[model samples]
Target: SEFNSECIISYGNSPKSFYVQMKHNSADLDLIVKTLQSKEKLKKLIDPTTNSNGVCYSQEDACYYRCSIKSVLDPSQGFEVFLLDYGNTLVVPEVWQLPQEIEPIPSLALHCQLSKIPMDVSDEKLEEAFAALLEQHFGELYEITTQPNEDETKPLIAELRINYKDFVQELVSTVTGVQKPLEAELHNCVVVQFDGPMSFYVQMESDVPALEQMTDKLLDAEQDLPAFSDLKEGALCVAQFPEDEVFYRAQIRKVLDDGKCEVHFIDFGNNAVTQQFRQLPEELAKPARYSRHCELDASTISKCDAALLQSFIDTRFSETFQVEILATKGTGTHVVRLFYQSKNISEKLQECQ
Candidate 1:
């Protein structure tokens, strides 16, 4: 009925179910082993050839310990024995009966099943649960609360905590996908450039606050940056857009034979040639928050129509627009409907048709 608060997970079958060894049992367990060894209390099993549903002790590495015979194999091949206290199994050729003094000692390992976790879960999910449990068991003590099970044969339903955080709640979120809703909002934006009829880059007006913070940090550390010549392709850095005359986060797409490098503006989704690269500060290392790649969801447009649409958008680059996000593609492009002056771009193209 009593549970130890300080325990370590010794074995786990699922994210929500495992066995723990109480730290408080260590001294008593040591004393039990000392008493057994001093008295020479281990006696040979009466019938080693037959399986018995009772406790026994097996000698492993010249040390005698208590266990239960899990199954009997051939007499020469030994039996599969489960160590009651350690919650481990091994095959041993022989085992012995313990004295009356140690026979009553209960199993030190406690079977703990997390309360309220779903019983029917996928095997893939169970594997993930097991891995998560392993991450928590880096020789740190876990606090636990156990409730008596209605079915006496089953493990006690329990709650486990580490550093005052609920283990079950975390496990539930990880496995069941029950998490806080992701925040998404529509923002006023300006089209920066067009790659084609379907693909283009836009800058969100809402990102001003975050962009200002990043800009301030980059400007403060601009003098200490490494030489631009040291920057390799695929490296992240801060670079100035020539026409805008402002610095933005960029990645070196390719190193050129000339001094200039092909830099992709990560936030604005446009590529430019620039040698003006600054080492990005650690504080600004988070993903670019302003620029987004957008695709027109107009899959019905013919090749000639698409060419006309591309030219129309190209002519209107740097113009303000309202972008309504409909969905996101697997390639990370925002599938969107673009509006300029309250008129859809597609509708305008139809008017011209």
Candidate 2:
């Protein structure tokens, strides 16, 4: 929706300074912010209520203009602009006798454009909250059509299979400090990928110093991240299916170096019971109950508390886990989180298969 003349008020005084005031009949006017470029004008009217004492020959003779702003629909931020000239007084607004300028919709609408979250956060509370914020303002634009393609691939990409393939690809990008979207997922496993930096810091694989920094972040995630803490640790990458429905499973597996672990992402979402994985008699690794087509065998997984999960991954899950995000339809986005000794790691419990 666009802002019209009826929705605005602009009045400017010539030969001195122009003051513009817009009275918005907004249910959420708090997010509206004013931006002006006059620093001297800014100092003059710190408070809108306090008027400046005009001189016979006022030094206030200067050209002052501001960019019209659109409100960000973030609930926390609400509607706002980047700058203003007063202490919230919008005084002497050059209320226009003529019709006001119509406001245009923002192209990069952050709050609304990025609302749909991945299955990693599909039913999660914070994800739900983000969705609610977008629906409030940009409901009409929510179901966006695909932008017309130039039909040129910057680089040739492979064909994609399941949605989870995109999910894991996003995860790898997240960890590896790259933004590699799935160019193509060949045969459900072999993904040809590219992104920010193939190398870590200065080198291809992160050196020890680099590893230490990532270790710190992993520790932080194990301690602080809610969704991550929920999943149980095991031999394979894992997830817990919501017991109410009991369809999905979360699993975590790794290629370990000493104690540190790196995870494989962008693969499969298995049905818990269908996989029918059984505990290997000799090895503790158990049956694959739900999550489909895993990176490693399920034998690797075993339930571990948060501290143990952290320790296991930091030392055992040697490689760094990347955070990747990808687009989804009703599912929203895939917040591909990597963990060390655990898959299905969020402390927020879900229905298990």
TM-score, structure 2 vs. true: 0.18
Task: Quantify all predictions' global Cα lDDT against the true fold.
Answer: 0.68, 0.25
Tens digits of lDDT, candidate 1, 130-165: 667558555566666677899887888887765334
Name the regions of candidate 2 deviating beyond 4 angstroms.
Answer: 1-304, 322-353
Candidate 1 colliding pairs, count: 1
lDDT of 2 at 187: 18
Worst 10 residues of 2 by lDDT: 195-204
